[PDB]
Design an enzyme around this catalytic site. Structure first.
Site, PDB file in Angstrom:
ATOM      1  N   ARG A  26       8.765   8.969  16.839  1.00  0.00           N
ATOM      2  CA  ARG A  26       8.391   7.665  17.422  1.00  0.00           C
ATOM      3  C   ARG A  26       8.184   7.929  18.845  1.00  0.00           C
ATOM      4  O   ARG A  26       9.177   8.019  19.592  1.00  0.00           O
ATOM      5  CB  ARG A  26       9.033   6.545  17.217  1.00  0.00           C
ATOM      6  N   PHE A  77       7.274   3.480  27.565  1.00  0.00           N
ATOM      7  CA  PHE A  77       8.262   2.834  27.004  1.00  0.00           C
ATOM      8  C   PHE A  77       9.591   4.227  26.858  1.00  0.00           C
ATOM      9  O   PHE A  77      10.472   4.173  27.474  1.00  0.00           O
ATOM     10  CB  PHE A  77       8.097   2.258  25.484  1.00  0.00           C
ATOM     11  N   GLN A 118      11.328   8.884  21.214  1.00  0.00           N
ATOM     12  CA  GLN A 118      12.655   9.038  20.276  1.00  0.00           C
ATOM     13  C   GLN A 118      12.593  10.105  19.352  1.00  0.00           C
ATOM     14  O   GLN A 118      11.477  10.598  18.573  1.00  0.00           O
ATOM     15  CB  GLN A 118      12.344   7.474  19.392  1.00  0.00           C
ATOM     16  N   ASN A 150      19.449   3.082  17.700  1.00  0.00           N
ATOM     17  CA  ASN A 150      20.602   2.443  16.680  1.00  0.00           C
ATOM     18  C   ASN A 150      19.787   1.535  15.874  1.00  0.00           C
ATOM     19  O   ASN A 150      18.788   1.171  16.035  1.00  0.00           O
ATOM     20  CB  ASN A 150      21.787   1.711  17.249  1.00  0.00           C
ATOM     21  N   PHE A 184      16.794   8.448  22.280  1.00  0.00           N
ATOM     22  CA  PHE A 184      15.597   8.523  22.984  1.00  0.00           C
ATOM     23  C   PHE A 184      15.637   8.791  24.518  1.00  0.00           C
ATOM     24  O   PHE A 184      16.731   8.595  25.128  1.00  0.00           O
ATOM     25  CB  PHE A 184      14.969   6.850  22.953  1.00  0.00           C
ATOM     26  N   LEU A 200      17.290  -3.177  27.150  1.00  0.00           N
ATOM     27  CA  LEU A 200      18.023  -2.435  26.180  1.00  0.00           C
ATOM     28  C   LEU A 200      19.496  -2.492  26.669  1.00  0.00           C
ATOM     29  O   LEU A 200      20.268  -1.727  26.029  1.00  0.00           O
ATOM     30  CB  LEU A 200      17.424  -0.982  25.561  1.00  0.00           C
ATOM     31  N   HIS A 250      21.916  -0.450  23.853  1.00  0.00           N
ATOM     32  CA  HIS A 250      21.871   0.954  23.525  1.00  0.00           C
ATOM     33  C   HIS A 250      22.898   1.525  24.402  1.00  0.00           C
ATOM     34  O   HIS A 250      22.832   1.332  25.516  1.00  0.00           O
ATOM     35  CB  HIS A 250      20.452   1.374  23.410  1.00  0.00           C
TER      36      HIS A 250
END
Length: 163
Positions: free
Chosen positions: A53, A58, A61, A100, A111, A120, A124
């Site tokens: 991903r 951003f 991942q 997660n 990531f 985040l 995370h």
């Protein structure tokens, strides 16, 4: 702090090496999980798996070496493990952090941020940072999309510990 590497290819073409410093000085349990999954010393780990991903502006991942789609993975601790602390923040590009599925659900997925992902923070666990090969991360990112589906198959062809 340990240094580890990911060698990444796109459709079989090498992109280069990402070197990550793991902040064992702040999150030793989370750093150790990632370190051991890079070396493969427990018989399983990241080698041969994908960045599944990738979303521009951003993050990139990876770490789902069981299902290759964001649903799987395996920690070194025999179960999903708790969020160790939220000390380190998602301050900018190059931050290495745990994926997660909610609180205390760490496994192997992780990531690398390509922007400050401050929303985040506290959700995370950040545990390291890129020290070499941010340009490789930018190349991975360039194969991402709005949905996160990649336009080339992005594989961790080798990984391990440098020091």
């Amino acid at each position: 702090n340990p240094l580890v590497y990911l060698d990444v290819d796109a459709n079989g073409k090498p992109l280069g090496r990402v070197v990550l410093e793991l902040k064992a000085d702040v999150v030793p349990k989370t750093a150790e999980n990632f370190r051991a999954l890079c070396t493969g010393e427990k018989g399983f780990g990241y080698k041969g798996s994908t960045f599944h991903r990738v979303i521009p502006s951003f993050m990139c991942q990876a770490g789902d070496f069981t299902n290759h789609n964001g649903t799987g993975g395996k920690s070194i601790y025999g179960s999903r493990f708790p969020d160790e602390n939220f000390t380190l923040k998602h301050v900018g590009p190059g931050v290495l952090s745990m994926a997660n599925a909610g609180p205390n659900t760490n496994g192997s997925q992780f990531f690398i941020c390509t922007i400050k992902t401050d929303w985040l923070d506290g959700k995370h666990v950040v545990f390291g940072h890129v020290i070499e090969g941010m340009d490789v991360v930018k190349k991975i990112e360039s194969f991402g999309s709005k949905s996160g589906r990649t336009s080339k198959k992005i594989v961790i062809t080798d990984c391990g510990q440098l020091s």
